[PDB]
Design a protein around this ligand. Structure first.
Ligand SMILES: CC1(C(=O)N2CCC[C@@H](c3nc(-c4ccc(C(=O)Nc5cc(C(F)(F)F)ccn5)cc4)c4c(N)nccn34)C2)COC1
Ligand SMILES: CN(C)CCCC(=O)N1CCC[C@H]1c1nc(-c2ccc(C(=O)Nc3nccs3)cc2)c2c(N)nccn12
Ligand SMILES: [Cl-]
Length: 256
């Protein structure tokens, strides 16, 4: 999985992402790639490198494709699929798109397929959120930065995407990714509002401890809201699987 860094040509600076700066470039003079440069001193490097190599074997149309790494230098580079329309959160917030609700539901379908695949590999994302999803030139949404929070050494914790058992007991599971997916659906249908937008993280955790929830964005139909709401059952084991959520999303697409 080691890419020769001399096969890379850097062409545009894209800004700072989670975990470090990202550039647009070409691999072998020809093929578009993104290059993420891991901030020095930020990662448990040996762990990160061993898992990166494992994660290289994950492949799905709706996961941002990992191509390779450059680890014989510092900073470490990660070479991935280039997603021309950038972060989903920013894309949602661009009012110029004038999105139809069918487009919003398709964004949810895209993410749900990626998550069903990760679930089928028993691999948790751990920080699923619109900020971490990316959009390609065809408007397809793909999931990225899965698993990576595990290597960050060591105000940043995803309180607003976490279920009660995480906030109270640090109980992480497939069902905490389910919860997060529901919040992501809310982000999509709210055109990128911050969840609990007028609450602090502290206030959010307290509201969640009291059993209270996000409510229906204006653009979410009753059927769509029912799906996102199902991700927030108090009891983790009554929350659906990604396979069930996908089937529910497909049914709505076929109806609405
Ligand atoms: C300018 C804005 C933006 O679009 N951003 C933030 C700056 C970075 C931008 C960005 N970030 C990325 C990006 C690149 C690489 C990774 C990555 O390394 N993911 C990864 C790596 C691993 C591994 F273990 F291999 F390290 C695992 C999982 N996921 C993640 C995200 C990409 C991309 N692929 N195309 C285009 C743009 N990309 C997105 C912010 O508001 C719009
Ligand atoms: C022709 C275009 C071309 O060569 N390209 C276009 C993007 C930069 C470059 C590139 N592509 C890839 C790649 C992509 C997908 C899969 C995959 O489909 N894997 C699967 N596994 C299982 C099923 S499908 C495997 C490898 C890789 C690679 N791993 N290292 C270096 C450069 N790479
Ligand atoms: Cl940059």
């Amino acid at each position: 999985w080691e890419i020769d860094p001399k096969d890379l040509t850097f062409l545009k600076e894209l800004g700072t992402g989670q975990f470090g700066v990202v550039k647009y470039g070409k691999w072998r003079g020809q093929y578009d790639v993104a290059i993420k440069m891991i901030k020095e001193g930020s990662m448990s490097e040996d762990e990160f490198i061993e898992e990166a190599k494992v994660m290289m074997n994950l492949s799905h149309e709706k996961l941002v494709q990992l191509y390779g790494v450059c680890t014989k230098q510092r900073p470490i580079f990660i070479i991935t699929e280039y997603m021309a329309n950038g972060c989903l959160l920013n894309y949602l917030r661009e009012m110029r798109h004038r999105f139809q609700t069918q487009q919003l539901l398709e964004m949810c379908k895209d993410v749900c397929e990626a998550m069903e695949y990760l679930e089928s590999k028993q691999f948790l994302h751990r920080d699923l959120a619109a900020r971490n999803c990316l959009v390609n030139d065809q408007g397809v949404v793909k999931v990225s930065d899965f698993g990576l929070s595990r290597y960050v050494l060591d105000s940043k914790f995803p309180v607003r995407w976490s279920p009660p058992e995480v906030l109270m007991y640090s109980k992480f599971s497939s069902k905490s990714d389910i919860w997060a997916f529901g919040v992501l659906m809310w982000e999509i249908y709210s055109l990128g509002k911050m969840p609990y937008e007028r609450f602090t993280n502290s206030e959010t955790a307290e509201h969640i401890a009291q059993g209270l929830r996000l409510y229906r964005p204006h653009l979410a139909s009753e059927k769509v809201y029912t799906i996102m709401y199902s991700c927030w059952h108090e009891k983790a084991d009554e929350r659906p699987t990604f396979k069930i959520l996908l089937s529910n999303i497909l049914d709505v697409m076929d109806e609405e």
